[PDB]
Amino acid sequence: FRTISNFMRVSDIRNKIIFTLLMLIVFRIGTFIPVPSVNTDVLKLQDQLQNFSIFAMGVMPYITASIIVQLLQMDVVPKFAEWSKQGEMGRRKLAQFTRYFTIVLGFIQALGMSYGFNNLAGGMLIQNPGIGTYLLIAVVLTAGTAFLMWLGEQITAKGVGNGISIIIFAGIVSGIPTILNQIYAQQFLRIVRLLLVALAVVAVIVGVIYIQQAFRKIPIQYAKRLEGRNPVGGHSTHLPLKVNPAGVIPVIFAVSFLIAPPTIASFFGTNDVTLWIRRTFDYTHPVGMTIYVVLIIAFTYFYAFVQVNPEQMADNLKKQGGYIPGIRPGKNTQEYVTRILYRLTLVGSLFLAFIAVLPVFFVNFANLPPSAQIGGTSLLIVVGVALETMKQLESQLVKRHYRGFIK
Amino acid sequence: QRVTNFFKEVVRELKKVSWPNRKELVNYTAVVLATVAFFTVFFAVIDLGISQLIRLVF
Amino acid sequence: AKKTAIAIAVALAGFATVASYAQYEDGCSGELEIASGYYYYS
Amino acid sequence: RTLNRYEKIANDIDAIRGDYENLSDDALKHKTIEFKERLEKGATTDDLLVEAFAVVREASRRVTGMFPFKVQLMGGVALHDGNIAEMKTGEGKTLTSTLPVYLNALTGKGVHVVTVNEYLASRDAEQMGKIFEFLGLTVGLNLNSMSKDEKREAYAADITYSTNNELGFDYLRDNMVLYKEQMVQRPLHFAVIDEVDSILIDEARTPLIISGQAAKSTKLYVQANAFVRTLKAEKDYTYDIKTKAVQLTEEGMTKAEKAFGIDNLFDVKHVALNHHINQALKAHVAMQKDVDYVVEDGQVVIVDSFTGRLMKGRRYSEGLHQAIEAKEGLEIQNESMTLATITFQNYFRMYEKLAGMTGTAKTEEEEFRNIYNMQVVTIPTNRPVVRDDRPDLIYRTMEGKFKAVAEDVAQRYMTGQPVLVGTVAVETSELISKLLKNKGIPHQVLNAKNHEREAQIIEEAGQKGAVTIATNMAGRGTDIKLGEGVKELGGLAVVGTERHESRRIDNQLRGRSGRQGDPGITQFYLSMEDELMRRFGAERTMAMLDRFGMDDSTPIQSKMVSRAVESSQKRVEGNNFDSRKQLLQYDDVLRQQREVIYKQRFEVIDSENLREIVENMIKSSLERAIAAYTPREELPEEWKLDGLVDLINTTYLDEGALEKSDIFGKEPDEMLELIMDRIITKYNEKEEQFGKEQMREFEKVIVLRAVDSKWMDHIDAMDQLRQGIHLRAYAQTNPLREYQMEGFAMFEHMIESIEDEVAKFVMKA
Ligand SMILES: Nc1ncnc2c1ncn2[C@@H]1O[C@H](COP(=O)(O)OP(=O)(O)O)[C@@H](O)[C@H]1O
Ligand SMILES: [Mg+2]
Fold it and tell me: Is residue D205 a part of any domain in this protein?
């Protein structure tokens, strides 16, 4: 195709995309190498009824550490409030504290994964279940996490785009070749059902891009024009608000807050109230499904009002610059944009709930393998990073040529 | 009732969002299917290659 | 207010670690989100 | 090593200086002629380096008696290599500028030399044009007083001296000529720059804006400022002193709508009125008189807080200088549409080769490599700097700080050596004056409101027994002199009121004393109650560890806190470097668009067969018109070709000159070929009665007025779009990327509108 040919004729951009493909090669050979424990054959023979590697935890502690620091910017903390107030070196100090917090958080959660393996099965235990080889496993898992985030730091500077998001893309789409190898190993519904499934996948990708790439343009007008000097100028200044501002963070919240009550269900008592609360807090069946939907909606509202907070934005438009036509730049603009976010994050909430409940209500009506992942996080991450990378790359060909009036 | 006129408010505000057009929609769909197919066949080729290489090194 | 967000962040990190003792439904991931000049006339 | 290369070239120049003696003025002009003919006969400038610098060295000896040291020779080689030769104050920077100017002037193009003001331009032009016109090279000179014929004679000479402002205004007025014989500058070859740290770093985003045809209306300015003189502080407007961000509150907004008699202030109808209210309110709340400007004879003159000096020629932007002139009852120069605009970094970016000496370029060396790809060579001095640059005595309580400032200058003045202290603002100079008058010490105060006696005070301020208080802590052209007694004492003593956020101003203050190997002592009596320690406030630890060991805040000569405040300077300057590195790549968009359309306007005014390019513009306009009214994907025979033939009959052809069936049902390529053949026939029919002269004058005035008007509109619209692109981050997009894409879309729409205007006006004469 001629777009890939246009990137083929530009040596610097094709050097950067070859750099990204080689860093994904580094990511792959980091995934294929085994762990120092001996239970790799055990998890191969069992199947635990996801996989396990040195990159098994992934960036998930760095995501939740970024969410922890962006929640403790809301309170009265003079330290982090002043680091956020400081423009550049407060941001770097904040990011380095976030790196320290995610490496200690991954270090304790790898120990938690070892303890959960011991409480799960007696085959995936180690020869010293209480003697500290778990610290060595935690150090090598956090070393893998540090290697992949340093890989992301390399590929966000020398490579194409958002370095964390490209390797998360790479990890999340690396299982669909196993799924498409499994689909005809289980197939033998002959084809009509498979073309209907492919049509529904293309239709839900059209739905997710039509919801995701949709902005609400509030036209802000800086006062710094002399209207008696020139004819009318800028319509090109506005405030873009998304339909779904939150992202996948509410879906990850609902995963966290519906897998946390199964620890209380992993009490040693295993009582009848334990089996009943485990039967109510599971979302493959409606009693957990409605809790999952309502908790997604609640935390979409919460994380919208965290990251696109109307009071901080209304103060940033009051201090340096200008206003919205008809609306005073104080608290009236904050009330106006709070109304706007009330009307947008409802649709973003319903969207995340619908797309996060598609896999359960999809594998039922298409009884084809239960490990297949389309929908929810599995769909939004791949589609958002995939088209954001091309929207980053196609902004160079417009830089390349200025075709004047003489030609 | 707050619910009915609030629903009217939401359905009137959603007609002011800058939705993608049909041609940019199908451009985005084509490029996202191209990227997902390109990276899944790149990952299948590297699966086969690294599997043969770890067969070689045993 | 402020201690409400403190409690939400602490309970979030807490139940994140609690679900992260197992995380048996994993494979999901996450993407975070004065002026002078020299003027001259004619 | 570059310094080994410089010293071996200096030794070669000294050996061939031993070769060169007792010739004639006729022999040296013959040397000039033979170096020019050797450059004509295949040889390059680097080959003739040693002989040319020997000729300039001996000629400077003959003319002015002063003989260049090898330090000046290695600095001249480092200036000829295209990069910057940093060398300290008092070492002859103009007579090390005189060497690569002569070497790059023998080629025959136009060498420029940049100073900071017309007085230093005239001084250097006289005392170096003696040396240059000892050898036959005609040296011009440039002012804003000269007319275009005198300026064309100046640039048409071999070597021109001027300021940076006049070079910039001559470039932007050569890009608005109507004929190639009106423009004054040659192709831009070379420029050494005096004080590169001020001309390419501090003044590196200052717009040389050429305005035109003012609006001629004082009415809204005087109404807005007469209204805002009736407001009360913290009841009608917030004001925070750390960042001048004066802004109305809702009762102030309501009484503004009351007094101006309007329904809503924050509407689209009252944008200019809202602008004039905010600028008058910023003018007489934020801008205090003798700390932010100074009134002179009929005009406001800007003072800043970075440097203590005041800028003569500047104006404030966005309509604030008019609000200051309206709050002081003066007469106002009105506002206009800008016709052109360049900065100092773009102007000196688009030369061919440039260089220039300075005093302080290390932090700005790691700046300069990113922008002008020039190194900074630290030139080793002639005589070693023997003055004492002692570490700074730091302690809290600014009253006690000023007390030991007064005690220090008192115990200096008991011995009798002069002391030049360095203040930042006017009020700290006032407090030092009130202390030193109460100590019985006579002195002289030199500020932004006592600036008429600057030459005499800086003349007699180095002599024995004279205390002076200077506000400009970086002295560019002002030179202290000292003879008897002061050399027998410890030279001029320097006292720093504070330590700046930039080390360059501090080093410029330190470099006033140790000139040409003379004694000196400097101090920076620094506080903890100042803005630098407020920005770098780790208050509790340092405050307690210097608080338990105190006696009325006794001074602490602390090397660890000296390195800590050096690290504080490095943090502030890293932040400044990152800010300039962001704003540069925001500026490169309009830089590239301006270079493209200035090159194409010079192609319009330079070439002689322009029927081809006007035919191409009419072809592109006509092709876009038929592509608009013929949908590319839709089937034919619904394409509203009646509207298309109406558009052609009202734009290109006459009213009844194009019919219905002759383009009916055919393809767009052949129908645009038919319509372009018909406009070529109409074009020759229109041409044939004034075929050669008046067709070309009419063509050129239509094309140039269309380019000028659409470029004025595009400057305005890119300004507004760069104002409003920072709000794009509230949808996680990249603001730089959306700026780079929408500036390109707007520039292509601009070129489409240029071609439409040129086509319409040349086809409807
Ligand atoms: N080789 C030399 N021999 C004698 N005097 C010199 C020599 N070089 C420079 N000077 C004198 O030193 C003075 C330095 O003034 P200036 O060059 O303006 O200072 P700066 O180099 O700090 O700009 C000049 O007036 C000049 O006459
Ligand atoms: Mg000088």
Answer: yes
